[PDB]
Amino acid sequence: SEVNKRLRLHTVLFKMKVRTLPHKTVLYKGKPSADGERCEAADKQEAQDNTCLHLEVFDFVGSEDGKSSKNLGAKFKKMELFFEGSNNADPDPRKEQPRNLTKIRTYIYQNNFLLEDKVISVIADVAPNGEPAHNDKIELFYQHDDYPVWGTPETPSEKGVGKYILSNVENTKSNPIRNNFKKQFYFKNLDYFDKLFTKIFDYNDRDSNKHYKKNVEALKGSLKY
């Protein structure tokens, strides 16, 4: 797919301060927490100590029927990029070289208050770059109504329940779960956050040009007298 290679260019966000964010979008940077499960927001967002990106997009249940304000539930889909090694010495974020990805974590949350339905889906790919076919290194974790508890591995009796790897499921013509998973959700999910990451940087990069132009404009006010 070569998509995750293009995600390597998104390391410029570490040394660039984030001011322009789209509606219902949350982004910050920090250091990996214990066990490398998630990211912990650093107190300073410009230091080289940070090695991770956190990006969250949240929505509301009932926005498809105009009842978003009715408080029918909450949902959010967020993805993170894990980087290895320290940042470059210079603090300029314009010139940053592509860097490898430790792992790509996909988090899906969807809770319905009235139906008392809650779906939490976690997808982690510990081998983003290095091998085009790394199915066995893709961890899937499905939780439904707080069952099973976090960290419970898949059992042969309950297939698909709990944390497991992508290679467990079949790719038969009868139930091509794996092939559909790549075509239906995974390919579109990566591209959606790929464009969004570029969307955030270009917006904040543009504001750098304007403030240079704003100073030029106020200086021309002296030419009239």
Binding site: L21, G66, D202
Partner: protein
């Protein structure tokens, strides 16, 4: 590679184990040969909807509706071209004032406009019937064949183009979305151009009638998504055209600081 040149969804007709199975089955039914029999239970007869012959047949019906609906548009262009050709060829012996031309020329346009809009609805019915033939096939094995992918794209392509002229923009949204989920159709800019207009059309309707902001953002978001996506697929990224669209979307959407 031409999928339509095949002329069939799949050519349906080896193993001695299978051949021996065929011989014993045909003789069981030959003893029960009752050509006038009609089963009281439809469940066993419904299994024929999964056969290759059934799918090889519904493909022809949709194709016939598609091919006939093509001729409606094709013949309409020939008529209009011949119509305006004859208007300038016949002598106008009673024409000596300037405003005579303006009214006569304007009369031709209303004649031509009636011809085109009549052709569209005449062609649209063939396209709509073609859709119902494709959606009733229940063989997922034969739904991924190249022939099915080509025709379902061509039927949807002509269906959306014809529906656009009748100002039925909101009805093209479900068909357009199903069109961009087949093969490399998502890489074509025209498919994303209509989505920009269609979602803009729905955006105005909620805006005009003063609906909830929730549906406004949904149509506004999908508008900007396929407006920028169509820009990428025509001029390329980081093009001067692409840069201007971002500024337009910049004021259009909502940002947080």
């Amino acid at each position: 590679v031409d999928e339509l040149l095949k002329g069939e969804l799949v050519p349906e007709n080896l193993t001695e184990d299978q051949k021996k199975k065929k011989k014993e089955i045909m003789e069981q039914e030959s003893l029960w040969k009752n050509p006038d029999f009609k089963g009281y239970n439809k469940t066993f007869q419904e299994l024929h909807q999964l056969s290759k012959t059934f799918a090889n047949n519904q493909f022809r019906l949709a194709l016939s509706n598609y091919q006939s609906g093509v001729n409606t548009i094709m013949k309409n262009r020939d008529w209009v071209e011949q119509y305006r050709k004859e208007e300038a060829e016949k002598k106008r012996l009673d024409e000596k004032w300037y405003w005579q031309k303006v009214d006569r020329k304007a009369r031709e346009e209303r004649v031509v406009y009636r011809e085109k809009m009549k052709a569209k609805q005449d062609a649209l019915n063939y396209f709509s019937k073609a859709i119902n033939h494709l959606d009733e096939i229940k063989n997922p094995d034969l739904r991924e064949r190249p022939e099915f992918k080509r025709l379902l794209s061509d039927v949807y392509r002509s269906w959306i183009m014809a529906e656009y002229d009748l100002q039925n923009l909101p009805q093209t949204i479900p068909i357009l979305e199903l069109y961009i989920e087949i093969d490399d159709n998502e890489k074509e800019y025209p498919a994303h151009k209509y989505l920009a207009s269609a979602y803009s059309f729905e955006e105005n309707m909620i805006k005009k009638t003063k609906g909830p902001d929730d549906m406004l953002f949904k149509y506004r978001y999908k508008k900007n998504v396929h407006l920028l996506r169509a820009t990428e697929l025509k001029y390329g990224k980081d093009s001067p055209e692409y840069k201007h669209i971002v500024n337009v979307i910049n004021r259009d959407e909502v940002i947080s600081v």
